């Protein structure tokens, strides 16, 4: 079509670029130029060290005729006599094409699978304009992850962003792998999966490459890897590359994408490091004052759109420093996002997989997906009843350890029985066991048989009369 | 050619008339030729940090630029050597200055330059194409490091045009020329390398071979794999010397690089005086370990710029020895001191402090440094395969575990061997606390266990369960009393006590218990479990443990006498002994249970 | 004496359990919080002097 043939006609153009052999200092990861002839803020340059090794940078400030450039791959070895820069006259752009699926790229988005270049269909800026809020539509759908604690007590509607808070050493990697292997719309497994890991060890990368290969999912995915020994500055670019790829795929080829960000804590650490190189005012615990906006411009790129069919769902994995939900990173992550699943250390010490407690987890869009026409009408309040009984079990057990076992009325005994069973049979499940929502709800009802009908108050009487007896 | 000095303040020197200085690079400053590291550049000036004391410097003194970052010499003559943080040979300085102090600015080559090595030309020969990482010869160094392979330094290519015949050569003679764009390269017996640049490798691999130590409690319950990582608490009463000595004496490794990154002095003199007295036993009472280990030592008053750049010097040597197809195992010492030195450097430079005072670098640098471990295949012609293992030692900063360093390193490593002074003070060696220690390489060792000893995992799981049940019973007996328990509980407690007393505890001061091979431990676990299960069986079928303990008699004696069979008598003898012991045990249980 | 001793042991053990379980950890958490706050103020003072 003609519209296709004109959007690229402007490509047939050649624009030479300058070479400035004039540096006037270096300090930390920064480099200062001079006599630059109309700089541009957020440009891209190509350092050519005297050794003959090329690097890359990005301007950050521009005064009358000075440009301050920060270099990605360190700054050592640079000289003020033989180096050479070259202004590309553009921001940073990524070559995208729907043939990226099934390939591997490194932190800078260049192939490492012993293949050719991308041979793009168009270039896209890694940043992107916000989405006109008037042109956004809320999900009204549900994903069946096959995890009872995730598919009954909470819920996930495609187009939603849900973190996974987990301490260090817990098997959040296994949970994420299971979810991505075992997710489909509740009556598809056609979720194209983009995956971006930043600040990881070799073992984690090998594990993730292994799991996606034996499940026959590697032919519809795309991996960006930035291991622990890679340059620190590049960790800021990687999530933007991954999200730009996802946005292209979804909103311009009409396919449902699911995104994973393996370690946001490393991203926050890199932000703090690069900030401290400059002298920005710090927030609490030393993190930058504007970290909230930076995180928001990463998370707030999911959802659906009016005129399209694609929808990109995020599952960022985040690690708390000392199991402290009051740390800045979890606080801002859960202020920006809509719900979050919590992986529990205490349940892990008892060999319970997935070690997920339900009290500190939430799902904002659960109340919309569930209801009638997709699941049973009891789903809305059985969750509330289970919540209340679990909370009562917790403090009943807490009281048992102080006064002994003398003031525990029958209520407390029933609550403790419920608490034991609700963890030893309901939450726990295998690493390859599916559970349709119907079966999970049947089991959940089975656990309310302990309580007599007369004191299940949070639940509605109508539901009780029609299900409590069957 | 030369730049003069412009200003001096503390350890910060600012030169002038210097154009052409890398951002990181070593310069010789002053008439004494002190060394320094360029930090900032702006036009001509170049801020420099001087490692040693700066007193006595005068404006106008010349400055020389070397032209490469902090490096390290690699080649023959590393084993049996003791160095400073920046590779200063201390055994030769004392011979040169003939004093007890380190002269300010003394400079001697890091490797002896007057000694004759016997070089054997490799399989390459003139006219052939050659690339970085290839082997083209060998050198004889010791009777223990029998062949020290010679490697073309990486990042070097071309066609060789001149090689030397086998003969007597010193480290200042060219022995190869490579033509790439002119016959203009001359390669000697050694080469240098930056210390902050990881050494290139062809391909990383996975760790699947255990690190054998000799102590049963570590090789059985919390194993470590070659190419892995570890950390253990550092204190006085506990004592990590029991770990270091055994690891350097009996490990299945071809080199050890001990690193001390800042210590108390006296308690460094008491380790420099021990290594040249430890004898390994292979092919006889072979020469001391010093033939096999290089040592880096840093007391507390060495230049701070060196006390923080030590763990980078040891790891580079470890990688160099890996590049030859060996199984190296570095051993750090109080990495907390290295972290403190790093904080001091940063604070003097001046930057926003992160949690508790340390700079933001700590979390990144720790992981970057730890990423250098692991098995790998070197890049070269004959397709070597080596590995490097790190065994850190986290020193509680002030006597706790809440500081940033301990958390950062505990989340990066994979193994932990807790040590408690309570066990040590009451004559319990090795003083391992078997409740807080853990190991994560368990499920990756199955490919080896099943191929060699299939039953390990079940046996170790059962023993851990036995100990857990024993302690469980123990937090209740003192309140409810021993009589309120069944006979199964008492059998479990007694077998747990037997294990705790004659399996975990090891002598380390004899020949029967100084190094327990793998089978010597597999058989002991088999015998212990065969005793426990057959004892439980009698209670299951109907009996009284009172009539079982007495009736058994020597059953509870032979198991404890198993450890008195010296492992130097041959594997077959001990295997037969153990099998006969199991047969006798089951026969007695067939008799006593009638 | 049996009855009186039972009563006394019951009350003392109850008090010990209460103190162990719901007093010490509360104070420890308070101490940790205050310790964090002190460093929080120190950072700001340092930043002002740096500026």
Describe it.
The PDB classes it as motor protein. The entry lists the keywords ATPase, proton pump, rotary motor enzyme, membrane protein, motor protein. CryoEM Structure of Reconstituted V-ATPase, state1. Chain A: V-type proton ATPase subunit B. The structure is cut from a larger assembly and holds chains A (470 residues), B (594 residues) and C (51 residues). In chain A, strand 2 and strand 3 form a beta hairpin. Chain A is α/β, with parallel strands linked by helices and 470 residues long. In chain A, helix 12 runs antiparallel to helix 13. Chain A is elongated, with a radius of gyration of 26 Å. Chain B has 4 domains: 69 residues, no CATH class; 296 residues, no CATH class; 73 residues, no CATH class; 155 residues, no CATH class. In chain B, 33% of the residues lie in helices and 18% in strands. Chain B contains 17 helices and 27 strands. In chain B, helix 14 runs antiparallel to helix 16. Chain C is mainly alpha-helical. Chain C contains 2 helices and no strands. Chains in contact: A-B, A-C, B-C. The interface between A and B is medium-sized, with 35 and 34 residues.
Keyphrases for this structure?
part of a larger assembly, 3 chains, A: 470 residues, seven-stranded parallel beta sheet, four-stranded antiparallel beta sheet, 14 helices, 17 strands, C: 51 residues, mainly alpha, 2 helices, 94% helix, hydrogen ion transport (chain A), transport (chain A), nucleotide-binding (chain A), ion transport (chain A)
Q: Pairing-aware structural class of the strands and helices of chain B?
A: alpha+beta
Q: Which structural class fits the helix and strand makeup of chain C?
A: mainly alpha
Shape of chain B: elongated
Q: Radius of gyration of chain B in whole Å, from Cα?
A: 29 Å
Largest sheet of chain B: 6 strands, antiparallel, barrel
Family (chain C): Belongs to the V-ATPase D subunit family.
Organism (chain C): Saccharomyces cerevisiae (strain ATCC 204508 / S288c) (Baker's yeast)
Protein name (chain C): V-type proton ATPase subunit D
Subcellular location (chain C): Vacuole membrane
């Amino acid at each position: 079509f003609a519209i296709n043939k004109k959007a690229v006609e402007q490509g047939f153009n050649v624009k030479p670029r300058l070479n400035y052999n004039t540096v006037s200092g270096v300090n930390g990861p920064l480099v200062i130029l001079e006599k630059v002839k109309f700089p541009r803020y957020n440009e891209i340059v190509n350092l050519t060290l005297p050794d003959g090794t090329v690097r890359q940078g990005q301007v950050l400030e521009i005064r009358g005729d000075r440009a301050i450039v920060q270099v990605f791959e360190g700054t050592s070895g640079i000289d003020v006599k033989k180096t050479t820069v070259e202004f590309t006259g553009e921001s940073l752009r990524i070559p995208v094409s729907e043939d990226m699926l099934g390939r591997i790229f490194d932190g800078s988005g260049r192939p490492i699978d012993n293949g050719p270049k991308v041979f793009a269909e168009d270039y896209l800026d890694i940043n992107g304009s916000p989405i006109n809020p008037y042109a956004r539509i809320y999900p009204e759908e549900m994903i069946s992850t096959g995890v009872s604690a995730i598919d009954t007590m909470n819920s996930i509607a495609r187009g939603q962003k849900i973190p996974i808070f987990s301490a260090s050493g817990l098997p959040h990697n296994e949970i994420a792998a299971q979810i991505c292997r075992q997710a489909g719309l509740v009556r598809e497994e056609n979720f194209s999966i983009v995956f971006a890991a930043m600040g990881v060890n070799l073992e984690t990368a090998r594990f993730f490459k292994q799991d996606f290969e034996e499940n026959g999912s590697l032919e519809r995915t795309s991996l960006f890897l930035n291991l622990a020994n890679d340059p620190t500055i590049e960790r800021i670019i990687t999530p933007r590359l991954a999200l730009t790829t996802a946005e292209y795929l979804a909103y311009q080829t009409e396919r449902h994408v699911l995104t994973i960000l393996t370690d946001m804590s490393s991203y926050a650490d890199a932000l703090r490091e690069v900030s401290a190189a400059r002298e920005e005012v710090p927030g609490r615990r030393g993190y930058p004052g504007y970290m909230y906006t930076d995180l928001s411009t990463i998370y707030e790129r999911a959802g659906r759109v009016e005129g399209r069919n694609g929808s990109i769902t995020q599952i960022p994995i985040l690690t708390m420093p000392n199991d402290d939900i009051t740390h800045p990173i979890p606080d801002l992550t859960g202020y920006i996002t809509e719900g979050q699943i919590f992986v529990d250390r205490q349940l892990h010490n008892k060999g319970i997989y997935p070690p997920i407690n339900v009290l500190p987890s939430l799902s904002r869009l659960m109340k919309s997906a569930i209801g009638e026409g997709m699941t049973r009408k009891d789903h809305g309040d059985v969750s509330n009843q289970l919540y209340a009984k679990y909370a009562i079990g917790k403090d009943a057990a807490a009281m048992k350890a102080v006064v002994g076992e003398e003031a525990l009325s029958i209520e407390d005994k029933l609550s403790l029985e419920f608490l034991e069973k609700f963890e030893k049979t309901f939450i726990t499940q295998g690493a390859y066991e599916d559970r349709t929502v119907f079966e999970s709800l049947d089991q959940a009802w089975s656990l309310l048989r302990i309580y007599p009908k007369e004191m299940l108050n949070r639940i509605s009487p109508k539901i009780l009369d029609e299900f409590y007896d069957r | 050619e030369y730049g003069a000095i412009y200003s001096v303040s503390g350890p910060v020197v600012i030169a002038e008339n210097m154009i052409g200085c890398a951002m990181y690079e070593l310069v010789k400053v002053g008439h004494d030729n002190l060394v320094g590291e360029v930090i900032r550049i702006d036009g001509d000036k170049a801020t420099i940090q001087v490692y040693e004391e700066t007193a006595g410097l005068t404006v106008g003194d010349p400055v020389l630029r070397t032209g490469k970052p902090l490096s390290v010499e690699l080649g023959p003559g590393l084993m049996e050597t003791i160095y400073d943080g920046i590779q200063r040979p201390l055994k030769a300085i004392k011979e040169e200055s003939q004093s007890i102090y380190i002269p300010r600015g003394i400079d001697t080559p890091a490797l002896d330059r007057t000694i004759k090595w016997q070089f054997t030309p490799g399989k390459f020969q003139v006219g052939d194409h050659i690339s970085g990482g290839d082997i083209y010869g060998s050198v004889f160094e010791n009777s223990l490091i029998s062949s020290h392979k010679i490697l073309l330094p990486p990042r070097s290519r071309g066609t060789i045009t001149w090689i030397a015949p086998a003969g007597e050569y010193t480290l200042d003679e060219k022995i190869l020329e490579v033509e790439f764009d002119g016959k203009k390269s001359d390669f000697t017996l050694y080469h240098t390398w930056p210390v902050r640049v990881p050494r290139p490798v062809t391909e990383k691999l996975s760790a699947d071979y255990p690190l054998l130590t000799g102590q049963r409690v570590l090789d059985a319950l919390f194993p470590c794999v070659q190419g892995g990582t570890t950390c253990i608490p550092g204190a006085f009463g506990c004592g990590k010397t029991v770990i270091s000595q055994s690891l350097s004496k009996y490990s299945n490794s071809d080199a050890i690089i001990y690193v001390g990154c800042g210590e108390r002095g006296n308690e460094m003199a008491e380790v420099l005086m021990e290594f040249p007295e430890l004898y390994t036993e292979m092919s006889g009472t072979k020469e001391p370990i010093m033939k096999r280990t290089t040592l880096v030592a840093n007391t507390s008053n060495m230049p701070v710029a060196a006390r923080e750049a030590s763990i980078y010097t040891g790891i580079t040597l470890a990688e160099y020895f890996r590049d030859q197809g060996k199984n190296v195992s570095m051993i750090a010492d109080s990495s907390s001191r290295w972290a403190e030195a790093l904080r001091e450097i940063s604070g003097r430079l001046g930057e926003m402090p992160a949690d508790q005072g340390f700079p933001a670098y700590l979390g990144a640098k720790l992981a970057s440094f730890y990423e250098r471990a692991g098995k790998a295949v070197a890049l070269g012609s004959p397709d070597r395969t080596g590995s490097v293992s790190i065994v850190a030692a986290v020193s509680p900063a002030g006597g706790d575990f809440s500081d940033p360093v301990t958390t950062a390193t505990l989340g990066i490593t994979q193994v932990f061997w807790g040590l408690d002074k309570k066990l040590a003070q009451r004559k319990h060696f090795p003083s391992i606390n078997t409740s807080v220690s853990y190991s994560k390489y368990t499920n990756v060792l199955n490919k080896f266990y099943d191929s060699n000893y299939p039953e390990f995992p079940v046996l170790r799981d059962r023993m851990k369960e036995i100990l857990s049940n024993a302690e469980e019973l123990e937090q209740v007996v003192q309140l409810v009393g021993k009589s309120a328990l069944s006979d199964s509980d008492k059998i479990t407690l007694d077998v747990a006590t037997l294990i705790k007393e004659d399996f975990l505890q090891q002598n380390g001061y004899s020949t029967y218990d100084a190094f327990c091979p793998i089978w010597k431990t597999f058989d002991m676990m088999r015998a212990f479990i065969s005793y426990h299960d057959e004892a439980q069986k009698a209670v299951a079928n109907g009996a009284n443990w009172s009539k079982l303990a007495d009736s058994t008699g020597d059953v509870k004696h032979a198991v404890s006498s198993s450890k008195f069979f010296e492992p130097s008598r041959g594997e077959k003898e001990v295997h037969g002994e153990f099998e006969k012991l199991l047969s006798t045990m089951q026969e007695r249980f067939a008799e006593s249970t009638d | 004496a049996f009855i009186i001793l039972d009563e006394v042991i019951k009350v003392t053990n109850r008090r010990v359990n209460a103190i162990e379980h719901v007093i010490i950890p509360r104070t420890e958490n308070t101490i940790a919080y205050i310790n964090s706050e002190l460093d929080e103020l120190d950072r700001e003072e340092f930043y002002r002097l740096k500026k």
